[PDB]
Structures are given as structure tokens and as C-alpha cells.
Amino acid sequence: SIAVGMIETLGFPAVVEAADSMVKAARVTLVGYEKIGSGRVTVIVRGDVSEVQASVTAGIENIRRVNGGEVLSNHIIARPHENLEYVLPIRYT
Amino acid sequence: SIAVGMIETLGFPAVVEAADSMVKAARVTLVGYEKIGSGRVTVIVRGDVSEVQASVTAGIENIRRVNGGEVLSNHIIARPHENLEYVLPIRYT
Amino acid sequence: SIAVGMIETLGFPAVVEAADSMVKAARVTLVGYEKIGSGRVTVIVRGDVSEVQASVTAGIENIRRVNGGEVLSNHIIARPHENLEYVLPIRYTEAVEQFREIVNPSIIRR
Amino acid sequence: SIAVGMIETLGFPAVVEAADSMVKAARVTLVGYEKIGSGRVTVIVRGDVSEVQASVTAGIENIRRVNGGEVLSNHIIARPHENLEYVLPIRYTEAVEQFREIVNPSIIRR
Amino acid sequence: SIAVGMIETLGFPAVVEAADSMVKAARVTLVGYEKIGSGRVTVIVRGDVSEVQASVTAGIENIRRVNGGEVLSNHIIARPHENLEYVLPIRYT
Amino acid sequence: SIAVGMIETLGFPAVVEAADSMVKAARVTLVGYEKIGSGRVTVIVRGDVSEVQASVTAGIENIRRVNGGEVLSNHIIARPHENLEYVLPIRYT
Amino acid sequence: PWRYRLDQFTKEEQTALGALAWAFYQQWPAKEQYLGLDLHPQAHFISCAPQAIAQLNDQVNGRIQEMVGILYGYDPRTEVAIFVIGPTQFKLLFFQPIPDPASCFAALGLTIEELKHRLEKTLQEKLA
Amino acid sequence: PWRYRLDQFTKEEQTALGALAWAFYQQWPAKEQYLGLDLHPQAHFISCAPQAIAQLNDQVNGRIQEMVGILYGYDPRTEVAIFVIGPTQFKLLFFQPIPDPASCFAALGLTIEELKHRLEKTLQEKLA
């Protein structure tokens, strides 16, 4: 519950397929898209702890089928602290 | 219902060549180019899944003739999830 | 007593796990994060210097457990004193008024 | 028919020598200068296709002369026909009227 | 035209230690930090030549105690030309 | 037109000493400061051909005294085309 | 703005302009002259040799360098290139008509005098 | 404007507040009570147990956990820490005075009853 999962890719087309696969394979909500340069882009979703684990794995699998896609990093947090909601872009805004 | 196609290119001259070929070869709409660092720019188009496939196929083939141009990544999503329309920059600005 | 600790990582997923572990492992507040490009993102907290030192240490250690995360730099800076403010949401009014009744009005020990 | 010549260089001094050589060795107009970051800058010319082709070739030959300048990519894109405009500064008002006397009012041969 | 002190560090945490160690070690005015890419940030101070000399020296000896920080460049101009104030970001703003 | 002088360095502190030494050693005018990424910054001067050539020589040799200064590129155009005045950021105003 | 109403006059009278361009190319087979258009005092067609337009470009320091290159390399059988003299601005009427200029001259069936006259009247009415 | 009036009262009454903190520190040497300041009727100092400021932080889910970290770790011999209850707000009176609060109470020569009365009198007037 109150989980946050995210996948960082090297390349923009791969991160779009990641976000499309996460929200489709489980009842999660894509909430954020972050750019930090060096071709690193991350899509952040929220949902149940079990829904995210399936959505993130579905995201990493579909990137393998992207021409030129590459996964840089991926992480799942069970339930983050409340102060993380009002700072990091893990929410709708 | 409307597909999304995208070609990530290294360099700017091969991005303009991609955008020029993708719109003249198919009935698609150009929604812009997205920079993520290291000179990686992705040209995004929307349209019918058949019109998008011909649009992306024409773009990749034209960048082959670009001196120094290189297609880093390319992908097409036939039916993107609606939640991606409000998070990822895929709508027409 | 009051300080700010910073952790810069190569990668955004690594900087979110860091900021989350920093507040779970100490009594600090996440004052924000900043990007300078090239995949370098820094999270900053603030609080007691011993809390911050416990906050930054757990942040560095938790990043090692991140698949694809890497630490770039980290530092802890001492800051001068200031009168901090904490504006709570209106949903915690029941907590502010309940605490205001349990307090002792007399500071002299009976 | 007209075209657009583009040269992308690693370094700003090289792109300045590129833009200078392109508009001198051919009959093209320097129309743009775009930056995408990471040290990549592109100059953009426009004109007759053959003029642009000689413009791009001359630009690349001069970038190899500068020290620390490198060519990253280059391409020529065909452009639709356009009613191009050329605003002349006020310092050239005498040249226009001198040209206005040389013209012939009758397009018919005598 | 008062003196100008500049320390270029690698990364953001190193540039905050430089900005902190330089203002509390002399009567210098913090002008700001300039981002130029590749994680290279430069703090800029203004003040007397004697203050800037001790200020820049204090910033260098504090970056060594930054796990991951490094001094890339450092320079002190005693009397910067008047024309530099209108071009380079060395003013208070 | 009026000759142009450029010195591109790797690092911000070195580009200030370059710009300070160009205007102090000849009758030139620092007209612009251009950053393009990857730590590449360029200072731009205008003036007579001999004055501009004296500026680039003085700016490069003064960078040797910058702790960590590195010159990436330098170039001079004796008579730049009038088209470049309105497109490239080398203009006075 | 004359610049905008010249763009309409170019796309509205595309066949009529293409016919006049071919009729001009007939009387100048080696392209020894370029079809012009002076807006002062009123809009009227003119012509000049490649030496005059190039000498002007030298006097303006390459400000019309692109226009003297288009007039030198454009194909008179497929595309139309007419230079306009305004107040202190130069506009190049440049377009490729869907029927080639030779086809436009035969489809309309108008002499060079009838094309030059009616086009001048049509443009001046748009400017007035 | 109650927030800015508390910033003035802190830097102006730096010696007097340190005297009241050192007097309150002797009332509870183990820091088992925290010197407070409630503004519900008039400006008056209060005190609470560490479990009170801890269960309040738990009830708000770590919103004020930094304030708890300051109250739990500030050195009473060199630092002053007073929490202020506001309308769904909390403000720390946190400062390091020169000289230390042990010297402020000695150099002032005022009992804890007269320290609390004058400071409440000074803050009630400063709020106006």
C-alpha cells in the first residue's frame, strides 16, 4: 500500500513504453516524469505494494522489446514518508 | 485510439531531417521534439497506427543518409494509455 | 546544532530512495532537491547536526541497495541558528488543540 | 527550388567560422543558429540547392582549420518554394535607387 | 571595481560547501554560482583583494573534506575590467 | 566588418581571466559570453584585426596562470560577413 | 502590408503569373533578363540583366545574396522567380506552378501584353 | 503579524530569554520538560513532557519531527529552545546567545518569577 515504483532509462522512447506497460499490467497510476540530463529519464507510478511490483517488472520486460531501449535503474519503495509527498515529484503535481 | 510514434536521434540536423520526413510521408501530426541530454532528441508524432508506422519507417530510412546522423532509439505504441497523455509530453502543444 | 546534509547521486531513482531513508532514519526535514544536469541530483535535509549525520549516513547506505543507483558526493554543512516555522495542514487541527490542553501552564516544578 | 544547409559542430568558435564560411563561399542566407546542449551547436543556411551544397561543403572545410573545432553532423533538407523577403537597412537606400534606374520598364524585347 | 573570487567545483554538494566556507571566512559578497555543464559549478564572490584571497583559500581547503567533491578551477582577479561587469555574471544579480 | 575574437575554455574561472586579459591588453570590446554545454564557455571580443589578435594572444597566455585553466578553442575572423551580425551573438547591442 | 497581399496575389494568380513568366522566358531564351516588379509609383513589371542584380548585391554587401543565386539557378520551364522592388525591402516571388509555365501560357491564351496589363491591374487593385 | 513579532522578541530579549531558559533548566535538570509559549489568551510560557511533543509528532505523521530533533538535542548550557503553539503552526525560539545562558541568568540577577513576568509583559506589548 502507498507504494512508489519508478524506472530510469537511457533514451526517451524506452521510458514511454515503460510507463505504458506499468499502468496497463496493474492498477497503478503514472504520476511523474522526471529528466535529470545525460539521457536519463524516469517515470514514477503509485499504487499498492503488490501492484507496483508487477507493473515495474512489466515495464522492464517491455523495454527489452524497444529498439535501442536500455534500463539504467529501477526501484520500488514499500511506503515512503509523508514528507516525501510534499517535496519529491512522487505525487500528481 | 490514436497511436504514437517516436524516433530518438543523436544531433540536431538529423532531428530536423526526421521531422521533415515523418510528416511528408504520412498523414500524422507533429507534437514536437523532446531533449533529454547528451544530444538525444526524440521527434514525436501522433496518428493512425498504419499512418504512424509509415511515418516512423520513412524517418529512420532518411537519417541513414544523414552524414553523422544516427538513430539511437525508435518505438511505436498503437494504443497508448490515457494516463500517459497527461504525464508524458505526447500531446500537441 | 542545526545543519544541512546533502547527498548527490547519479540517477533519479537513487535520489528518491535516499531522501526517503534520510527522513525515516532521523528527525530531519527534507528541504528539497536540486538538479545541476548530467544526471546529478542532490537531496538536502535539515535538523539537528547529530540527526543530520545519522540521516546522511543511512542515505548513503540505502543507495547501495538500489538496482542501478550510484552515489556521487555527500557533505554536511553547519548552519547558524534561526527561528524555524512549521505550518501544518488544517486536517491536523485536532492534534494542535489536543496537545495545547495536555501542556502544563506552570513552568515552575511543584 | 531551395534547400536548407545545416552543420553541427562541437564548440562555439568552430560554428562561428562555419557560419562565416557558408555565407561567403556561396549565395545563401544564414537563417538560424540553434543549440541543443552538451556542446553541440548548429548553424542553418538557406538558398538555392546548388548554392546550399557549395555552402555546406565550404563550411566543413573551414572547421577542420580551426583548433579545437570538430564537425558532428551535417545535412541538406529540401524546402518548398517561398516568397522570400530581404529587408535592406537605410544605409543602402542609394543603392536601391541606382538599381531602379538600370531596370527596363518594358519586359518586351524592344 | 572590487576583486572577484571564483572556485569551480564538481557537483552541487561541493559547491554549497565552497559558498559557505567562503562567506564566513571573509567580508566577501556572495554573487552566486554559475552552471556551465558536466556538473561544473563555480561560486563567485566580490570584495577587497585581501578578503577574496583568504575567502578563496578557505573554500579550497574545505572541499578536500567533501566525500566526492573536487576543486576544478580557481582564480582571483584583483581589478576586473569595467566591461566585464556588463558581460560576465560577476555582479550582485 | 569589424574583426571578432573568441576564446573557448573548459571551465568558468579560466574564461573570466581570458576575458579580463583581452580587454586590458588591446583596444577591443568584450561583447558576449556564450555557454553551449559540456563545460564549454566562450568569451567574444570585437575590434581591429591587430587589436583582436593581441587579445587572443594575451588571453591564452594568461590562462596558464589560472590553477586549472584549459583552453579548448580559439579563433579570429578578420572580416566577418554582415549576415553573422544579426544571427550569431557577436553583436555589441 | 504589401508583403502579405503579394503572397495572396502569388497564390491566387498562380496560373496568370506562370503564363507571363513563360512569355518573358520566350523573348529572353538564354535568360539574359529577369522578370521584375516595381511597386513605385504603382505596381508594374520590369526587367533587368544578371549584371544589374549582382552589382546591386555587391553594393548592399550580400544582403540579397540569396536572391541573386535563386535567379541564377532556377529552371524557367518549371518554376517562376520574380523579384519585387519595394520601399527599402526586396521580395522574391518564387513558386513552382502545378502546370509548367509553358502550359499556363497555352491554357490562358493571352498575349504577353494582355498578361502584363491584367496582372498589373489586379495587383494595384489589391494594394489600393 | 504575530510571526514577525516573535522574531523581534527573540533577538532583542536574547539575554533575558537565556536567563529564563537557564532557570527552567534548573527546574528540570534531565530536560524532562520543554519550555513552551502559548498564545491562546495572552502570551504566556508553558511546559510539556517529552512524550507530549513526541505523541504530537506521531499524530501528525512526522510533520514536526525536525522540531522534535531540535528540542531533544539542543545543549541547554549554550542554546535556547522554546516551542510556540500557533493556529495549526509551530515556531521554534532557537538561538545560541552570547554569553551562555548560565551567564545571562547571572549577569541579569532576576528570579524565575520576575523573568517569566517581565518576558510575558514584554511579549504582550510587542504583539500590540
Backbone angles phi, psi at E35, to 5 degrees: -95, 130
- Residue D67 is given by DSSP the state B
- Mark which residues 57-96 of C lie under 8 Å from E by CB: 71-75, 77
Could you tell me which CATH class the domain C2-83 is placed in?
alpha beta
Backbone angles phi, psi at A31, to 5 degrees: -115, -25
Q: How far off is chain A from B89, nearest CA to CA, in Å?
A: 9
- Residue A67 is given by DSSP the state B
Residues of chain E immediately before an interruption (C to N > 2.5 Å)? none
Residue E6 CB partners (closer than 8 Å, separation 6+): E42, E43, E44, E45, E56, E73, E74, E75, E76, F12, F13, F16
> Are chains H and F touching, using the cut-off of 8 Å on CB pairs and a minimum of 3 such pairs?
no
- Residue B88 is given by DSSP the state S
A43 contacts in chain B (CB < 8 Å): 87-88
Nearest chain B residue (CA) to D78: B20
What single-letter amino acid sits at H16?
A
**CB of C55 closer than 8 Å to CB of H51:** no
Q: Is E37 on the interface with D (CB under 8 A)?
A: yes
Q: C39 is written with which cell numbers?
A: 544526471
Q: To what resolution in angstroms was this structure determined?
A: 3.0
Pairing of strands D2-10, C85-87: unpaired
Q: A92 is written with which cell numbers?
A: 500528481
Q: Is G98 on the interface with D (CB under 8 A)?
A: no
CA H114 to the chain's CA centroid: 16
Pairing of strands A71-77, A3-10: antiparallel
H-only helix segments in chain D: 12-24, 49-63, 93-102
Pairing of strands B3-10, B70-77: antiparallel
Four-residue CA torsion sign, G23, G28, G31, G33: negative
User: At which residue does the C-alpha cell 491591374 appear?
Assistant: G121
Per the entry, the structure determination technique was X-ray
Length of chain D: 110
E35 contacts in chain D (CB < 8 Å): none
Map chain G to HEC letters: CHHHHHHHHHHHCHHHHHHHHHHHHHHCCCCCCEEEEECCCCCECCEECHHHHHHHHHHCCCCCHHHHHHHHHCCCCCCEEEEEECCCEEEEEEECCCCCHHHHHHHHCCCHHHHHHHHHHHHHHHHC
Using the beta-carbon criterion (under 8 Å), do C84 and H91 form an inter-chain contact? yes
B78 contacts in chain A (CB < 8 Å): none
- Residue F48 is given by DSSP the state -
Domains contained in chain H, number? 1
Q: D80 is written with which cell numbers?
A: 518548398
- CA–CA separation, G39 and D85 (whole Å): 15
Using the beta-carbon criterion (under 8 Å), do F75 and D14 form an inter-chain contact? yes
Give the number of other CB atoms < 10 A from CB of residue F49. Answer: 14
Q: How far off is chain E from C18, nearest CA to CA, in Å?
A: 15
D19 contacts in chain F (CB < 8 Å): 83-84, 87-88
| Greatest pairwise CA separation for chain E in angstroms | 38
**CB of H16 closer than 8 Å to CB of H6:** no
Single out the residue of B51, B68, B46, B72 nearest to residue B60, CA to CA. B72
- CA–CA separation, C34 and C26 (whole Å): 21
> Are chains C and E touching, using the cut-off of 8 Å on CB pairs and a minimum of 3 such pairs?
yes
Pairing of strands C28-37, B70-77: unpaired
- CA–CA separation, B45 and F2 (whole Å): 45
**Could you tell me how many CB contacts below 8 A there are between chain A and chain H?**
6
User: At which residue does the C-alpha cell 515503460 appear?
Assistant: A18
> Are chains G and D touching, using the cut-off of 8 Å on CB pairs and a minimum of 3 such pairs?
yes
Report CA-CA distances (Å) from G84 to G14, G64, G88.
16, 12, 11
Report CA-CA distances (Å) from D61 to D17, D19, D21, D69, H29.
10, 12, 9, 11, 82
Pairing of strands H34-38, H80-86: parallel
Q: How far off is chain D from F14, nearest CA to CA, in Å?
A: 16
CATH number of F3-77: 3.30.70.1710
Q: State whether residue E33 is helix, strand or coil.
A: strand
Does the domain made of A3-84 have the CATH classification 3.40.50.720?
no
Asked if omega into G41 is within 30° of 0 (cis), the reply is yes
- CA–CA separation, G40 and G18 (whole Å): 23
A81 contacts in chain C (CB < 8 Å): 20, 23-24
**CB of E55 closer than 8 Å to CB of E61:** no
- CA–CA separation, D29 and G61 (whole Å): 12
First vs last Cα of chain G: how many Å apart? 11
Chains with 3 or more CB pairs under 8 A to chain F: D, E, G
- CA–CA separation, D23 and F81 (whole Å): 7
B83 contacts in chain A (CB < 8 Å): 23, 29-30
- CA–CA separation, C87 and H66 (whole Å): 13
Q: G73 is written with which cell numbers?
A: 539557378
**Strand partners of residue C34:** C42
Does the domain made of D2-81 have the CATH classification 3.30.565.10?
no
- CA–CA separation, G78 and H36 (whole Å): 90
Q: How far off is chain E from D53, nearest CA to CA, in Å?
A: 34
Q: How far off is chain E from C36, nearest CA to CA, in Å?
A: 6
Residue C10 CB partners (closer than 8 Å, separation 6+): C39, C40, C69, C70, C71, C72
Single out the residue of H18, H23, H12, H31 nearest to residue H100, CA to CA. H18
**CB of D75 closer than 8 Å to CB of B13:** yes
H67 contacts in chain C (CB < 8 Å): 84, 86
Give the number of other CB atoms < 10 A from CB of residue D67. Answer: 12
Q: How far off is chain F from D21, nearest CA to CA, in Å?
A: 9
Q: G45 is written with which cell numbers?
A: 513589371
- CA–CA separation, H64 and D9 (whole Å): 53
What single-letter amino acid sits at H119?
L
- CA–CA separation, A75 and C20 (whole Å): 12
The answer for C88, left when phi > 0, alpha when psi is -120 to 50, beta otherwise, is beta
Q: State whether residue F67 is helix, strand or coil.
A: strand
Report CA-CA distances (Å) from H93 to H35, H67, H70, H81, H128.
10, 10, 11, 5, 20
Using the beta-carbon criterion (under 8 Å), do A12 and B40 form an inter-chain contact? yes
Q: How far off is chain G from F47, nearest CA to CA, in Å?
A: 20
Q: Burial letters for G77-105: b for 16+ Cβ neighbours within 10 Å, e otherwise?
A: eebbbbbbbbeeebbbbbbbbeebbbbbb
CATH architecture of the domain covering B3-85:
2-Layer Sandwich (3.30)
Does the domain made of E3-86 have the CATH classification 3.40.50.620?
no
Pairing of strands B40-47, B3-10: antiparallel
Chains with 3 or more CB pairs under 8 A to chain D: B, E, F, G
H36 contacts in chain C (CB < 8 Å): 103
E72 membership: H or E segment, kind and range: strand E71-77
Map B15-74 to HEC letters: HHHHHHHHHHCCCCEEEEEEECCCCEEEEEEEECHHHHHHHHHHHHHHHCCCECCEEEEE
H37 contacts in chain C (CB < 8 Å): none
Nearest to D40 among B16, B17, B39 (CB): B39
Tell me chain H's radius of gyration from C-alpha atoms: 14
| Beta strand residue intervals within chain F, DSSP E | 3-10, 29-37, 40-47, 71-77
